[PDB]
Design a protein around this ligand. Structure first.
Ligand SMILES: Cc1cccc(O)c1O
Ligand SMILES: Cc1cccc(O)c1O
Ligand SMILES: Cc1cccc(O)c1O
Ligand SMILES: Cc1cccc(O)c1O
Ligand SMILES: Cc1cccc(O)c1O
Ligand SMILES: Cc1cccc(O)c1O
Ligand SMILES: [Fe+2]
Ligand SMILES: [Fe+2]
Ligand SMILES: [Fe+2]
Ligand SMILES: [Fe+2]
Ligand SMILES: [Fe+2]
Ligand SMILES: [Fe+2]
Ligand SMILES: [Fe+2]
Ligand SMILES: [Fe+2]
Ligand SMILES: [Fe+2]
Ligand SMILES: [Fe+2]
Ligand SMILES: [Fe+2]
Ligand SMILES: [Fe+2]
Lengths: 288, 288, 288, 288, 288, 288
């Protein structure tokens, strides 16, 4: 069973811009360059984000973490039973990712996905942020979340819930103009309100944004000013209606957006599915 | 599985009297008028109580909340297997209620019931009470409770426990005169001591009272004076023997009573069924 | 310096009525009869209330406690310097009161007052209430409080503040009819909001009421029913505006009233004098 | 000794605009109109802000609170010894302000000031905000603070510290252009970081802004959107360097600004005076 | 000003019996033998109890601790002003005691007393008890207490309070037969209820007993059995009325008794002097 | 009155070695270079340590912080009354130090000392350590401490206690060989066990070491390895007997040592002077 989103990889046209953006604006730690690409850390794990040179300027792959080898076997089995083409990653790929075992496949719309177990910890190389950030929230909640843009939400929903096992948290009916309302589905696989959201938005990218969660309000406020100085803010500070995250959005060098937030609420056993008509309680004024 | 009582609707002869009673006396928030009727809020949900014009001057319907679409399916199945006529609410009714999906049916004695999932939240329109009330207790405990008057308690008990899944908390042997003792059964579907109580009382209404729980003793004390000013108190302040709620009772414009309380105890896994011979430890002097 | 109100004595016409009232209705502990009269306890002290046969049917004397012999000396000196006639209680009186040393005198309007130190504790005879009461709040706050009725508030105020050292907490302008508004002054000598209140009320007694504070809301609720059964309630449950005490008032066999409350707020160093136009936030409906 | 800022009065050209601004945008409670003007509440006190019709469109007077009559006497004495013309407010003014006693005078630059004791509490009329606000922080910290604009900071400083007794918290060197740096002095009279700030800013008003502190971040976020809707924001959300308050600034109908914040730090006994070169850690982008 | 009882020395006829008693029965740590005698520890201090060979079989001297050299000077001055013969301990005595400075003198009835400052700590030699004891309570409360038997309580009281500065906690009227009642005075110099008690008991020793306080009830229970095995118990387990200590008493090899207790209450600023007629709430049955 | 040690300045022969040592080994933040020298931060203050090129390779000056201008005046007065030559720092020096006001003078043995008030805070430039360090403990405890080597301890003691106002915490008799025992005196001016220690050690430097305190054990462990890699450790990890600090010592490029520790205990009002015969409970093995 998938426990969390463990890592993500981006294929970008300007690797240098990304390196500077992630470290100096967002405060991630530069962890070196390997055949896996430029590596960035936010906690004890050897890397959480990989940046590789590429033409797409988008998310290249995402890795979901299981607890152990048995969990990996279960997922591989579940995918095969669903008719999905799964490939047991070879030692070379496993070594490149720094994991113990992994399987590779793609979602219904071509996003390369990986499920793995036994990632590398580097407690001996204590995390030191590239900018003043008190800390990132990961742990059992994993890396954070991202919104997957799809041409067909129902097909995407079936794959992610029925095959991958994500559970629905809530739905937000996004009013995009008078004759257009698009439902965005928020899914969880652990306590984090959502690790994945699905929506049929008309965008040139695989994802609308990815999100990183920090430990204090000041982390967000300081990062906002750093990003604003270069005119990269896309949405002002605000708080979401569903996860209650206080955040701002900014544009990465690839056009893909990043959400930087704090204080999200978690999902518990007493959770019930609900619907909303607005994605924000306050703030989040679009300055795009 | 039913998680809680989510909403209630009243069909009354004097809608204006009700509007003034709920907002000015009890402190509910007016949430507008729709084809669902005059809507009132007590928390983040779009509405909890609906008031419609009608001749019965009584509870018109009650909606029980399940966690998701699977839960709705389970309940529909359970009802069908019991031989109950269930109707899958159409999009029009679902839209009118502001829910994602729902099924409709009636209890053995004609009370229209609805089981739904995916109600609407309105965090962007922060709750502001119509009178000075610090807050209402809902959350996982739902709306509150009501006492269903029935001609046959055993038939009602079987339906609510065996078909709807409520569990018995305790029983109170109500001494109504020398030759009459009527057992009142208190049932729960979550932590709240009881979400439903059943008793064969000789009343012209479907329910004896509905109850709303507030956050502080002062909320109760202030509301008591507001209600008393118009001579609407039916029972003085007292504390119940079973749920330990400190409350007073008052008459609504429909004759149906409302209980306004604070500090009830909850039911846990170690709970055991017991019986009582009195419904109150102290207070609750009838001034009817 | 006066630390608290330590004990009170009543001279009543019906000693038996008082004994039954204090133990069975209020829950005090009967502590035996001596030359000091029928003694009642509420904590570890040998006695807090003494009931003696007498014609006045009123408060006969009150004893204020100092910390030690030096404190007694200070107060005696302060009184003498003010021209008050003070009498050093003799060993016989000290033994009768169960104290180590004491001085006697009277307030400007004839109420016998005593200031003493070294009262008797009886931890070896654990307190057992005469009725179901979880506990009384005394400790550093002392016995409770009483309202002294006087013909001239200014003269009384000067004596109690300038000579006895009480400090003003707040004032309540009591509206007693269209052409009459009487200010009631509330004074403290420790954390308890007020140990003494002064008002020019037209009453045949030295005090309007004395107050005892209990540990839980249920103590108050149960006592209310016990007292109400005999038709002795004078004011329904309510909460005061100044000390925030939740209480009810009842008539004692002498006509003097008793206030039985819970949850009063205390006075701290940041306290500032304020004024109120009402003595109650809610409740306290006079049923006299 | 001055314990806090207790109330403020504004003389404005558009009373209706102010009424709507304070209740609907900021969430204050309308408390009626008297010869003291339109009254607004934020807590248990009968009024904290008074709005009167007037030509200045500015702060008309401010009242500082002492603990009691002795404190009032001390301050009156201190002012007289300093050669300040003090007037003992007459019963008519005291009644108009709803206080027990007060003295009136002016600061060195003509701002009418009042020092009083024994203000009116109205616990019987529970605070109900005009907009969704969880609460305002007052208590021992008083009303909030305001920045007094003066032509000569040193003269103002001497009066406020040496005569009124305020203590310096810190100084911020405000860089207003290449050839201009103006020191702003922040003073406290209790735990609140500053109740008064003094700066020689070139403004047509007596004060730059007044500040109200709320209980949660959401109170600030929601109010920001309410104010922004009418285009009244003057500074975006940010956090100050000295008091660590998270706030935004907005324009009132008089041009005078209001700061609405949350989470300020307090001053303790271990506090030491420091200096800063910036008034904000992050945010507070001027949108004037 | 005396801060606490720091150490005690005994002059006994059977040093070996004492060594075995203190370590094996009470659990003290043997700290070696010096010209100061056999040393025993109960905490970080180099020694708290010294046992020397001697004929008296009693307390030979007690040392009271001041905070520093200034405190020592104050006490020396206070004693001289009282006409007491004080001797500044020489370097040889100071070195023998392991202190920085000390003065010697005697109480009115010949008990050698010492007031010192700058005792030796031995954190590098961690405390290891001679028997299973979780810990001893010392710290700011010092060593414990002892009861000084005197022929004249009033003379002793004057010396200890007026000259040494101890403060009275309470008094217990000890009923020793029909025609004899002896008051025992309990004095404190810090939070410990009493560091010294004075009573005119007819005993051949300078003290009735000394007391050591342990950290848990089991420490007391286990020690009781160890002592009882040798038939040395003098009083069964019980709890005192004044300090609320749960303890038992036992005979030392010198006839002098030792009290071993747990859970005593402390004295605070709100403390007031009281009197008791019994020294125990329960237990403490004399088995002498 | 001196509140704490605020800053220190070093005059060294190899500024580059120091820059690398402080940032890379100890984790301080580089704060730029000014006419005050290379500046390093450990908290919100603009700088705490200044490194200037110089021949002495030692501590050049230390600055003690007072709360305000009045405190500065008091100290200046105290020094003058003692016959010490004090110089009111001019605006140029004040600006160079980034303080509001300061006075300069020297200790009896030539160490330049400064007492100042109103240092600069830079909350807008959040602290970011040069190495992985969770945080430094400063606040009311100030910078840390240093041991001043002197030829005459008694003369130094008189100056620091009688003139500067430091209070003695404790003394450690340092056994330096058979015929040599040197007392080291530890003094405090706030909660930190000692801000200054004085000892007549035969060293070529003004100070034996300065100490910086970090927030966690791992901060110390990681720094130890960083320093050990270059063979700079002088004492292994250990814990002191007096302040209970867990620390290691290392050599700076000037030969002067630095102590890096965690978990020291503080001094409270109940503190009493004591003596020790060892400076360490465990560890601190000299590897010099
Ligand atoms: C668009 C959107 C809506 C709700 C929560 C989110 O985190 C989000 O990005
Ligand atoms: C009648 C009754 C009895 C017990 C608990 C209740 O809430 C109630 O209404
Ligand atoms: C009359 C009255 C008013 C305020 C507080 C009280 O306790 C009281 O008795
Ligand atoms: C201008 C300014 C600077 C610091 C704190 C404040 O509250 C403020 O208004
Ligand atoms: C005799 C006696 C009485 C009260 C407390 C004690 O500790 C004691 O020893
Ligand atoms: C030498 C020494 C002794 C005790 C505590 C210390 O911090 C220290 O440096
Ligand atoms: Fe789930
Ligand atoms: Fe998001
Ligand atoms: Fe159950
Ligand atoms: Fe009920
Ligand atoms: Fe007071
Ligand atoms: Fe009262
Ligand atoms: Fe201050
Ligand atoms: Fe401000
Ligand atoms: Fe005392
Ligand atoms: Fe004892
Ligand atoms: Fe000290
Ligand atoms: Fe050190």
């Amino acid at each position: 069973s998938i426990r969390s989103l463990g890592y993500m990889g981006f294929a970008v046209s300007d690797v240098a811009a990304w390196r500077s953006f992630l470290t100096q604006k967002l405060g991630l730690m530069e962890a070196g360059t390997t055949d896996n690409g430029d590596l960035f850390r936010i906690d004890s794990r050897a890397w959480r984000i990989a940046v590789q040179q590429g033409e797409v300027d988008d998310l290249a792959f995402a890795g979901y973490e299981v607890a152990d080898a048995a969990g990996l076997a279960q997922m591989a089995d579940k995918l095969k039973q669903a008719g999905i083409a799964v490939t047991t990653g070879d030692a070379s790929l496993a070594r490149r990712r720094g994991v113990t075992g992994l399987i590779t496949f793609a979602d219904p719309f071509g996003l390369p996905l990986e499920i793995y177990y036994g990632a590398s910890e580097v407690f001996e190389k204590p995390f030191l942020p590239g900018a003043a950030v008190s800390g990132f929230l990961t742990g059992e909640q994993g890396l954070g979340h991202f919104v997957r843009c799809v041409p067909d939400s129902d097909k995407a929903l079936a794959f992610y819930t029925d095959v991958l096992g994500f559970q629905l948290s809530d739905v937000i009916d996004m009013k995009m103009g008078p004759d257009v309302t698009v439902p965005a589905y928020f899914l969880h696989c652990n306590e984090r309100h959502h690790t994945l959201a699905i929506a049929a938005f008309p965008l040139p990218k695989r994802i609308h944004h990815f999100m990183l969660e920090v430990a204090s309000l000041d982390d967000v406020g300081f990062a906002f000013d750093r990003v604003d100085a270069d005119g990269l803010i896309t949405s002002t500070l605000g708080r979401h209606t569903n996860d209650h995250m206080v955040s701002f959005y900014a544009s990465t060098p690839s056009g893909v957006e990043v959400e930087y937030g704090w204080s999200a609420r978690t999902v518990d056993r007493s959770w019930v599915v609900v619907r909303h008509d607005s994605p924000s309680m306050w703030g989040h004024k679009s300055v795009r």
